[PDB]
């Protein structure tokens, strides 16, 4: 259908533009669509892009607005004091501000559908909210509307919520356009999606991105596919992967690298209201925080992640138990059988379940998928599904049988309720993944596993050495393999912190010389150095010129292949803010060959200082461009939980950064 009104190139310079005579008499019927292409790289704190109001004295609360905040939040108000209606719908972190220093043209589509009684907002091709109401308020049925306004709302004759920005194009339709029609509207997106709601993972949420460039030229990404909102474990979370063979222009449909099936893969809209938002899937096993490296020698791609048994997360994990029993120099996985108070079993060689009290093998075995067999026959459990149909979160059996896994709630034999690290490998560069295997304890029988640092492992350039950083209380614990990941040893580097989330990423400054950058509790990013390929580590120092919050945020880092200003270069990706997870930057450091110190010379702004930026992944793409996959929202904020499609990918060139 043709638009009833269309205008363009409006500059919003803290002065409203009146379009009443062009639009108001054209509005008819109870359904409308607004399509608006707009820029705002220096927004006010709160500003209206579009308003329909009763501007008469005594009717200040009779209006419709489309508004934004300098946080990147988008929203609408629909109000009529006579009808007693005051709707306010919004979602944080919905907008772009700048990309490569130029203002981004955001494409906004707002559908007011009277038949459905639903208000739906899309920005940049992403649905950010869809709200169904009991009593529908058509945007043009507001009592006494007499002004149509761009860049403010006219209330009682005055300009409220003045906007700074521009509207390149605005169209209105006297119809609620269908989802199919919305999808045909052209976009000018500065970003891509690799993982997204509705894809093959069927997760509605995603966190903790990784990127790694393989020697073939293929670029690989992994991620937490989070089902029960954006919550850390305890929850349902799988590790998913996708790859690109064209320098990041397109990406394969995701597959899983690690997955559990005790709960259904459900695409669920997790509630965002204050009463329900902390609802958390509490009976599911999960994976969380993945990291990838490529092994030159074997050709294998190796991926590690934390594993959490049913109902377990960092919070309630059995500290003081590895989950393993050491028996004459070997670690065996412990099991507790239904009805016992203690863990009287171990998993011996060939998956044989052994009774530690009677010292006899049982007629139970654990296969390579950690599934329980009895007399060689596969046992099963019934799968759970989740719903909020009763007004609160419900977890219940759904009629479907799946293999009984020792990480599951319903399993006859259960592992120790603590955190583990698992490893999987791919021999076809991410096209498929082998069944995962648990790594052994590294810090003793009665110490819970260390926590994997998400992002990349490190493959040393002049040897076969592989290193994955992990952390625990009081130290970074580096896991080192010289045999393609078949065996691992630890290298402990104490840090002056108790219980910090010390997420660490490494760069090889030169042969044998490793610099590790890591998150702390001090508001500054820290670093340490190894000059012997990770055997021993320096004391801790801190980077100046970058701010983090007290709780900190994961940081990613690479050694760039090409010289910059004649020097070896490291690139760092992090929020640069003392206030929240926002103000995303790539910081380019030039290495001083004399002393290995780094001159942090260039700071590239990913988007606005006030716009969200949390966990991130960076890689040098085969064409020497930089790929960034990152959480474009404040993933700490309790106001920004459970947003869909905020993990986004962008392509940059080195000249963009300098
Ligand atoms: O809250 S954030 O800093 O965004 C994420 C922190 N996750 C913590 C970590 C999760 C997996 C293993 C236990 C600890």
Task: Choose which residue among 235, 278, 289, 471 to substitute to test ligand 1 binding: the one with the highest number of ligand atoms within 8 A of its C-beta.
Answer: 289
371 bridge partner residues: 405
Rounded distance from Cα 232 to ligand 1 centre (Å): 6
Looking at the structure, tell me whether residues 519 and 619 fall in a common domain.
yes
Looking at the structure, tell me whether residues 637 and 621 fall in a common domain.
yes
Which residues have a Cβ under 8 Å from the Cβ of 16 and sit 6 or more positions away?
149, 150, 151, 152, 154, 159, 162
Give exposure, 282-297, as e/b (b: 16+ Cβ within 10 Å). Answer: bbbbbbbbbbbbbbee
- The Cα 480–Cα 442 span in angstroms is 11
Residue 431 sits in a domain whose CATH number is 2.120.10.10
DSSP 24: G
Residue 390 sits in a domain whose CATH number is 2.40.220.10
Residue 550 near residue 534, CB atoms below 8 Å: no
- The Cα 569–Cα 571 span in angstroms is 7
Residue 557 near residue 537, CB atoms below 8 Å: no
- The Cα 426–Cα 410 span in angstroms is 30
Rounded distance from Cα 173 to ligand 1 centre (Å): 45
Give exposure, 431-454, as e/b (b: 16+ Cβ within 10 Å). Answer: eebeebebbbbbbeeebbbbbbbb
Q: Is 519 annotated as a binding residue?
A: yes
Looking at the structure, tell me whether residues 304 and 393 fall in a common domain.
no
Task: Choose which residue among 290, 501, 635, 637 to substitute to test ligand 1 binding: the one with the highest number of ligand atoms within 8 A of its C-beta.
Answer: 501
What SS3 state is found at 514? strand
Looking at the structure, tell me whether residues 478 and 450 fall in a common domain.
yes
- The Cα 297–Cα 261 span in angstroms is 34
Looking at the structure, tell me whether residues 223 and 152 fall in a common domain.
no
Ligand 1 neighbours (beta carbon < 6 A): 232, 288-289, 306, 314, 451, 501, 635-636
Closest CA to 411 of 503, 336, 519: 336
| Phi and psi angles of residue 511, each rounded to the nearest 5 degrees, phi first | -45, 120
Looking at the structure, tell me whether residues 217 and 174 fall in a common domain.
no
- The Cα 257–Cα 240 span in angstroms is 6
Q: Which helix (H) or strand (E) segment is 20 a member of?
A: helix 20-23
**Residue count of the chain:** 658
- The Cα 207–Cα 224 span in angstroms is 5
End-of-domain residue from the set 156, 190, 224: 190
Which residues have a Cβ under 8 Å from the Cβ of 23 and sit 6 or more positions away?
4, 5, 148, 172
**Which protein residue's CA is at the shortest distance from atom 7 of ligand 1?**
232
| Phi and psi angles of residue 528, each rounded to the nearest 5 degrees, phi first | -145, 165
What SS3 state is found at 22? helix
Looking at the structure, tell me whether residues 331 and 379 fall in a common domain.
yes
Nearest-10 Cα torsion for 18, 24, 27, 33: 10
End-of-domain residue from the set 401, 417, 433: 417
Helix, strand, coil share (%) of the chain residues, nearest 5: 5, 45, 50
378 bridge partner residues: 373
The resolution, in Å, is: 2.0
DSSP letters, 132-157, are E-SS---TT-STT--EEEESSEEETT
Looking at the structure, tell me whether residues 277 and 369 fall in a common domain.
no
Residue 53 sits in a domain whose CATH number is 2.60.120.200
Which residues have a Cβ under 8 Å from the Cβ of 354 and sit 6 or more positions away?
332, 345, 346, 347, 348, 360, 361, 362
Handedness of CA 11, 12, 14, 18 (dihedral sign): positive
Tell me whether residue 338 is exposed, middle or buried, using C-beta atoms within 10 angstroms of its C-beta: 0 to 12, 13 to 18, 19 or more.
exposed
What the block records as the tokens of 369 is 């998928």
- The Cα 168–Cα 9 span in angstroms is 4
DSSP letters, 283-347, are S--EEEEEEEEE-TTT--EEEEEEEE-TT--TTT--TT--SEEEETTEEEEEEEETT-SS--EEE
Looking at the structure, tell me whether residues 447 and 514 fall in a common domain.
yes
Closest CA to 526 of 497, 498, 499, 485: 497
Active site residues: 232, 503, 615
Domain range enclosing 134: 1-190
Tell me whether residue 594 is exposed, middle or buried, using C-beta atoms within 10 angstroms of its C-beta: 0 to 12, 13 to 18, 19 or more.
exposed
Looking at the structure, tell me whether residues 105 and 213 fall in a common domain.
no
Rounded distance from Cα 158 to ligand 1 centre (Å): 48
Provide the number of structural domains found in the chain: 3
Looking at the structure, tell me whether residues 385 and 433 fall in a common domain.
no
Looking at the structure, tell me whether residues 307 and 449 fall in a common domain.
yes
Residue 32 near residue 139, CB atoms below 8 Å: yes
Rounded distance from Cα 419 to ligand 1 centre (Å): 12
Q: Is the peptide bond between 234 and the residue preceding it cis, with omega within 30 degrees of 0?
A: yes
End-of-domain residue from the set 363, 382, 417: 417
- The Cα 553–Cα 208 span in angstroms is 11
Degrees to nearest 5, angle at CA 111 with 110 and 113: 160
């Amino acid at each position: 259908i043709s638009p009833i009104f269309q205008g363009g190139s409006y500059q919003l310079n803290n002065k409203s533009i009146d379009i009443s005579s062009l639009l108001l008499d054209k509005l008819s019927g109870e359904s409308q669509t607004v399509v608006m292409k707009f820029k705002a790289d220096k927004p006010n704190s709160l500003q209206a892009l579009f308003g329909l109001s009763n501007s008469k004295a005594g009717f200040k609360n009779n209006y419709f607005s489309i508004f934004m905040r300098d946080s990147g939040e988008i929203g609408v108000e629909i109000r009529d004091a006579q009808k007693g209606i005051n709707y306010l719908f919004s979602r944080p972190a919905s907008l772009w501000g700048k990309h490569k220093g130029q203002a981004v043209e955001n494409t906004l589509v707002f559908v007011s559908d009277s038949k459905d009684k639903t208000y739906t907002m899309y920005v940049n091709g992403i649905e950010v909210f869809s709200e169904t109401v009991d009593t529908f308020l058509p945007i043009s049925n507001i009592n006494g509307i007499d002004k149509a306004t761009l860049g403010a709302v006219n209330r009682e004759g005055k300009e409220h919520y003045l906007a700074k920005g521009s509207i390149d194009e605005i169209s209105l339709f006297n119809k609620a356009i269908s989802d199919q029609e919305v999808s045909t509207i052209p976009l000018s997106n500065p970003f891509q999606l690799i993982f997204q709601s509705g894809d093959s993972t069927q997760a509605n949420y995603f966190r903790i991105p990784t990127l790694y460039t393989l020697s073939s030229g293929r670029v690989l990404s992994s991620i937490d596919a989070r089902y029960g909102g954006t919550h850390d474990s305890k929850s349902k979370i799988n590790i998913a992967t996708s790859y690109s063979d064209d320098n990041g222009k397109t990406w394969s449909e995701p597959i899983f690298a690690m997955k559990f099936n005790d709960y259904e893969e459900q695409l669920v809209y997790w509630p965002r209201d204050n009463k329900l938002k902390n609802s958390q899937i509490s009976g599911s096993a999960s994976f969380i925080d993945s990291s990838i490296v490529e092994d030159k020698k074997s050709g294998k791609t190796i991926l590690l992640a934390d594993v959490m048994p049913a109902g377990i997360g960092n919070n309630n994990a059995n500290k003081a138990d590895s989950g393993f029993k050491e028996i004459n120099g070997h670690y065996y996985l412990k099991l507790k059988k239904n009805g016992d108070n203690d863990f009287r079993y171990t998993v011996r060689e060939n998956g044989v379940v052994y009774n530690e009290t009677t010292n006899k093998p049982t007629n139970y075995t654990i296969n390579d998928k950690y599934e329980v067999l009895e007399g060689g026959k596969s046992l099963t459990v019934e799968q759970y599904s989740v719903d909020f149909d009763s007004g609160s979160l419900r977890e219940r059996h759904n009629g479907k049988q799946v293999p009984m896994n020792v990480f599951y709630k319903d399993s006859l034999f259960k592992v120790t309720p603590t955190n583990y690290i698992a490893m999987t490998t791919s021999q076809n560069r991410g096209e498929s993944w082998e069944q995962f295997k648990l790594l052994p304890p590294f810090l003793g029988e009665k110490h819970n596993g260390t926590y994997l640092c998400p992002g990349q492992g490190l493959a040393l350039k002049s040897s076969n050495r592989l290193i994955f950083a992990t952390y625990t209380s009081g130290e970074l614990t580096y896991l080192i393999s010289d045999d393609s990941g078949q065996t691992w040893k630890k290298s402990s580097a104490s840090i002056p912190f108790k219980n910090a989330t010390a997420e660490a990423q490494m760069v090889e400054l030169r042969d044998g010389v490793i610099r590790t950058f890591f998150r702390t509790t001090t508001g500054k990013i820290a670093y340490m150095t190894s000059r012997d390929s990770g055997e021993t580590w320096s004391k801790v120092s801190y980077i100046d010129g970058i701010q983090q919050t007290s709780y900190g945020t994961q940081v990613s880092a690479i050694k760039y292949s090409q010289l910059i200003d004649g020097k070896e270069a490291v690139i760092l990706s992090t929020p640069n803010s003392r206030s929240g997870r926002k103000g995303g930057q790539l910081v380019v450091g030039l290495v001083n060959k004399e002393d290995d110190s780094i001159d942090w010379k260039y700071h590239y702004d990913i988007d606005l200082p006030s716009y969200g930026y949390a966990y991130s992944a960076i890689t040098e793409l085969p064409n020497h461009h930089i790929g960034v996959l990152f959480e474009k929202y404040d993933s700490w904020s309790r106001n920004e939980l459970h947003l869909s499609n905020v993990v986004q990918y962008i392509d940059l060139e080195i000249n963009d950064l300098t």
